[PDB]
């Protein structure tokens, strides 16, 4: 069958859908994946036919409303959920014309979207084909839905809807120990990494004679360009008897004797003792899946609550970026206390026991 | 488990192994794929961790022997098999130092190689781990083995071997109707395309008001750079009531835009555009042949040497293709009209598509790889 995958505006959103898209292609299905123009090379470098959904970057949708007026940034975690629903809602609204042009010429039998790829819900409703919602992290996939429904009220009213339509199938990757009590029934799936690759050098897959700490701020150029966070973290680990690796975009690495640049996370994370990040859901999954403890230093966003569930489980520590010596103390505790790695290995075993993307293809086929 | 895939020196060799490598990664295995330095971006753009096996291109291995002496190019199809075994053998020999450095630090539990990725056979024997040979086209995977064994005699002697070791498992993609009578038993697999991708434009996935002819000379820059073949084919199709698309490397398309204006030339993901075509015209490329076969599209084979010529003749004898004895305007023009006009060719191509579709999925074949280390 013809399956249209809808990613968003960040490389992590392409990576989160690449296992199921490649599994469907491997089963003989005709698969296309859509994302913002800037993300098209990431889809192509995942080996999937790529279509552009809008020529605008995430920064356009984040900083301004539909009328082009400046949007104030969130000040609290409660504000973050509403703010995300709105900018993801705006990106979805800005993606409809290109998705209509593509699906008029190549009509999919099924549409698969990520957590906040709301244009997948809308185009599937317009086409009258089943809509599959795939969680792209261990956070609640529906966590920005009320604000997103409010943003997309004109598009939803045109379809005769009052809120975002419920998917025909919900595909979840959250391991049982991290799933909330109010989580809806789902087709579970084993998350597997599918991040951007590059020529491997021996240091990437071989551990050194010292503990290794990986530091990253994600794959979003608009947030990664704020090098202050990465320089701050590197400065806070100076006293530790540890090798520090900065995993960041190559163009950001240019501005930064510390190793900085794109290092395929799935390859390097099993050689690390700690993974330090900005509260990025897919980096969080890479660490968990490899059974590696992680330090979460939240830089806003909407994964903060889900990252606190990993911390409460004991496979991570959530600290404040602006509490002196907190990053240093937490790194020492994650390397030195074996309980963090034991809980991370427990989460790795839970992920490994979930249905394979190859088996989940059968659930997509059952819908049509 | 840790699985090392070994591609060769051409993008098509990376594409031929990418479905099984991604299926193994999708099953939770740790997968690395090796190829010549020039092919490393193709592995990475297939979403697979990439290691370089040698810094030398296929041109180095094709034109010079180990002592640096010039190698004369073959003339006959019998000569082609021996020429290929010797140059693939040289590429394999030149790949051993880097594969030893990689596998000393990342020890695989299993090694999977393409049809003529002979370094996969040697590195697996050295490590003492099972070796999986995966056919990368419908041609006989073992067709260059005697000359390859001769070339790799120093490396094989060091392992106490007289010839290339037999794989622990042979994975074949050749549909039953095209398999020779002397083909060894195999784990069959459904071939799926996994070629280099691009931003899609509507013309790539939408057919026009006229029949569409795709023309290509493959993904090897050393052979694609010979633009004469592509220019020649387009000129031979001028009288036909059909649109012509040239699928070639972008750096080769740069030369064609100043030489042949008004014709579309450049990298088109073949899996996307081939179902919109009436005919696929190629240089006798096995993976293009499979793309056409799988989409149920008739194909025109205009052999430019190589070792797929015999396997392409089997498709031609089955009736899902035509091979031309000479590259003349009259033969290319006639065979084209016959592939568009006579419905039997597409009927046969759809039969081969149904045979491929009935073979075990790459996801199921992962289980056969696991059974070898069990
Ligand atoms: C910089 C860098 C990144 N990556 C990959 C790893 C991971 O798959 C992705 C980074 O994503 P991450 O979860 O760190 O955050 P972000 O890129 O900001 O992605 C956003 C925010 C997440 O919280 C959310 O779960 C994503 C779906 C979108 O990119 C690499 O493999 N190597 C690198 O060097
Ligand atoms: C130029 C071009 C190529 N491709 C892909 C399609 C196909 O997967 C591959 C071309 O391989 P092909 O079978 O045409 O031949 P070649 O590139 O010369 O590959 C050699 C010779 C084959 O006979 C043998 O089967 C290959 C493994 C190696 O590259 C595209 O998707 N788009 C393009 O524009
Ligand atoms: Mg000899």
Per DSSP, the residues of B193-214 read ------B--HHHHS--SS-EEE
Can you tell me the distance from the alpha carbon of B135 to that of B113, in angstroms, rounded to the nearest whole number? 9
Best CA proximity match to A112, nearest among A357, A281, A307, A354: A357
The rounded Å distance from CA B248 to ligand 2 centre is 9
Task: Compute and round to an integer the Cα radius of gyration of chain A.
Answer: 20
Q: Do B102 and A199 touch (CB under 8 A)?
A: no
**Tokens at residue A34, please?**
């859509």
Q: Which residue of B has its CA nearest to A360?
A: B26
Report, in this order, helix, strand and coil percent for chain A, each rounded to 5. 45, 15, 40
Provide the CA A134 distance to its chain's centre, in angstroms: 11
Strands (E), chain A: 2-6, 30-35, 50-52, 110-113, 131-134, 169-172, 187-188, 212-216, 243-247, 259-261, 274-277, 294-296, 316-318
Shortest distance between the Cα of A288 and any Cα of chain B, in A, equals 14
The rounded Å distance from CA A200 to ligand 1 centre is 19
Kindly state whether A100 is in contact with chain B, defined as any CB-CB distance less than 8 angstroms.
Answer: no
The rounded Å distance from CA A188 to ligand 1 centre is 22
**Tokens at residue A214, please?**
């990986």
To the question of domain B200-358 being in CATH 3.30.465.10, the answer is: no
Strands (E), B205-260: 212-216, 243-247
Q: Is A263 among the annotated ligand-binding positions?
A: yes
Q: Do A199 and B27 touch (CB under 8 A)?
A: no
| Region class of B352: left (phi > 0), else alpha (psi between -120 and 50), else beta | alpha
For residue A336, CA distances in Å to A145, A339, B292 come to 40, 9, 58
CATH architecture of B1-189+359-374: 3-Layer(aba) Sandwich (3.40)
Nearest neighbour of B28 by CB, restricted to A46, A190, A198: A190
Resolution to 1 decimal, in Å?
2.2
Q: Which residue of B has its CA nearest to A102?
A: B202
The rounded Å distance from CA B144 to ligand 2 centre is 19
Q: Which residue of A has its CA nearest to B356?
A: A28
Cβ contacts below 8 Å, chain A against chain B, sum to 116
Report, in this order, helix, strand and coil percent for chain B, each rounded to 5. 45, 15, 40
- Residues with their C more than 2.5 Å from the N of the next written residue in chain B, i.e. before a break, are none
To the question of domain A200-353 being in CATH 3.40.120.10, the answer is: no
Same topology between domain B1-189+359-374 and domain B200-358 = yes
Provide the CA B33 distance to its chain's centre, in angstroms: 16
**Tokens at residue B355, please?**
């045979």
Superfamily (CATH H level) for A1-189+354-368: Glycogen Phosphorylase B; (3.40.50.2000)
Are A296 and A279 a contacting pair, CB within 8 Å? yes
Those residues with Cβ within 8 angstroms of residue A220's Cβ, 6 or more apart along the chain or in another chain: A10, A11, A12, A58
**Tokens at residue A225, please?**
């360009």
Kindly state whether B359 is in contact with chain A, defined as any CB-CB distance less than 8 angstroms.
Answer: no
**Tokens at residue B131, please?**
């070796």
Q: Is A45 among the annotated ligand-binding positions?
A: no
Can you tell me the distance from the alpha carbon of A133 to that of A167, in angstroms, rounded to the nearest whole number? 6
Domain extent listing, chain B: 1-189+359-374, 200-358
Can you tell me the distance from the alpha carbon of A255 to that of A272, in angstroms, rounded to the nearest whole number? 24
Can you tell me the distance from the alpha carbon of A122 to that of B82, in angstroms, rounded to the nearest whole number? 58
Best CA proximity match to A109, nearest among A31, A178, A33: A31
Kindly state whether B328 is in contact with chain A, defined as any CB-CB distance less than 8 angstroms.
Answer: no
Residue A283 near ligand 1, beta carbon < 6 Å: yes
Helix (H, G, I), strand (E, B) or coil at B306: coil
The residue whose CA is least distant from atom 5 of ligand 1 is A195
């Amino acid at each position: 069958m013809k399956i249209l995958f809808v990613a968003a505006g960040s490389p992590a959103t392409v990576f989160a859908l690449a296992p199921l898209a490649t599994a469907a292609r491997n089963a003989g299905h005709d698969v296309f994946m859509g994302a913002v123009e800037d993300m098209v090379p990431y889809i192509a470098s995942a080996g999937i036919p790529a279509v552009a959904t809008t020529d605008l970057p995430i920064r356009h949708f984040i900083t301004m409303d539909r009328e082009g007026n400046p949007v104030r940034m969130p000040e609290t975690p409660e504000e973050e959920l509403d703010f995300a629903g709105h900018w993801f809602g705006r990106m979805a609204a800005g993606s409809m014309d290109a998705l209509r042009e593509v699906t008029a010429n190549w009509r999919p039998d099924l549409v698969v979207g990520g957590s906040m790829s709301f244009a997948a819900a809308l185009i599937a409703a317009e086409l009258g084909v089943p809509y599959v919602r795939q969680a792209w992290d261990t956070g609640d996939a529906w966590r920005t839905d009320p604000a997103a429904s409010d943003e997309l009220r004109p598009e939803l009213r045109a379809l005769g809807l009052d809120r975002l339509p419920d998917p025909a199938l919900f595909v979840d990757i959250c391991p049982p120990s991290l799933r909330p009590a109010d989580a809806p029934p789902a087709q579970m799936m084993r998350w597997v990494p599918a991040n951007g690759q590059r020529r491997l050098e021996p240091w990437m897959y071989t551990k050194g004679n010292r503990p290794r700490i990986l530091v990253t701020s994600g794959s979003r150029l608009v947030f990664a360009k704020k090098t202050g966070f990465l320089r701050g973290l590197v400065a806070d680990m100076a006293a530790l008897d540890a090798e520090v690796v900065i995993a960041t975009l190559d163009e950001v690495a240019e501005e930064l004797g510390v190793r900085a640049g794109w290092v395929p996370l799935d390859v390097v994370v099993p050689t690390c003792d700690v993974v330090v990040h900005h509260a990025g859901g897919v980096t969080a999954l890479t660490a968990m899946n490899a059974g590696v403890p992680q330090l979460i230093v939240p830089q806003g966003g909407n994964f903060v609550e889900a990252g606190l569930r990993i911390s409460d489980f004991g496979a991570a520590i959530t600290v404040d970026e602006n509490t002196p010596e907190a990053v240093e103390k937490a790194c020492g505790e994650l390397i030195g206390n074996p309980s963090y790695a034991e809980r991370a290995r427990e989460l790795s075993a839970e992920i490994a026991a979930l249905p394979l993307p190859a088996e989940v293809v059968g659930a997509l086929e059952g819908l049509v």
